[PDB]
Amino acid sequence: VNSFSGYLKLTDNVYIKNADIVEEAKKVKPTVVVNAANVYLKHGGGVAGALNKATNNAMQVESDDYIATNGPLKVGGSCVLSGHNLAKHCLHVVGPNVNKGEDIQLLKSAYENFNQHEVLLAPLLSAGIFGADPIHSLRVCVDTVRTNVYLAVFDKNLYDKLVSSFL
Ligand SMILES: Cc1c[nH]c2ncnc(NCC3(O)CCOCC3)c12
Numbered sequence: 001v002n003s004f005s006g007y008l009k010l011t012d013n014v015y016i017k018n019a020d021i022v023e024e025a026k027k028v029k030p031t032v033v034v035n036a037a038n039v040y041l042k043h044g045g046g047v048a049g050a051l052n053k054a055t056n057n058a059m060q061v062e063s064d065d066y067i068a069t070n071g072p073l074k075v076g077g078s079c080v081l082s083g084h085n086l087a088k089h090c091l092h093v094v095g096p097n098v099n100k101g102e103d104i105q106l107l108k109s110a111y112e113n114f115n116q117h118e119v120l121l122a123p124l125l126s127a128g129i130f131g132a133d134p135i136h137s138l139r140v141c142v143d144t145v146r147t148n149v150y151l152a153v154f155d156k157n158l159y160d161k162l163v164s165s166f167l
């Protein structure tokens, strides 16, 4: 039993809700919140910009030190950093950005990072400003993640389309 509330159950392990991931994280304080990161951990917009803003830019400060030490992530890769005031940890995961020409096949590799964590609050990877089809992202999520994932979908219209079209 966990404290996630109001989710629709899609499969044995995947749950979904129309919610602002920032507000969900502030309420639940999950062990892991997933960020829709880029390889530079530059949290400018989309989910990343919103999460970072909610930390009063502390996420960005921590991320800049991480990059200065370690260099950029790989597309499809991840790193674990602090969750600040939102969660215990933030798993920064880089899905392919279609608006940069990146290989959509890397979306499966990106979701594989979730399997290193028993329970996660997450957005759909590569959705929104990353330019992928969210219906496809949900399919890859369900077919790749085996741990317990609670998906927050900001757009109500999109949430309804994802549920209604789910096979
Ligand atoms: C931008 C943003 C702020 N707070 C959020 N919480 C959750 N998701 C988000 N964006 C990603 C999508 O949910 C958007 C529409 O289609 C699926 C991907 C955001």
Ligand SMILES: [Cl-]
Binding pocket: 045, 046, 047, 127, 128, 129, 130
């Ligand atoms: Cl977005």
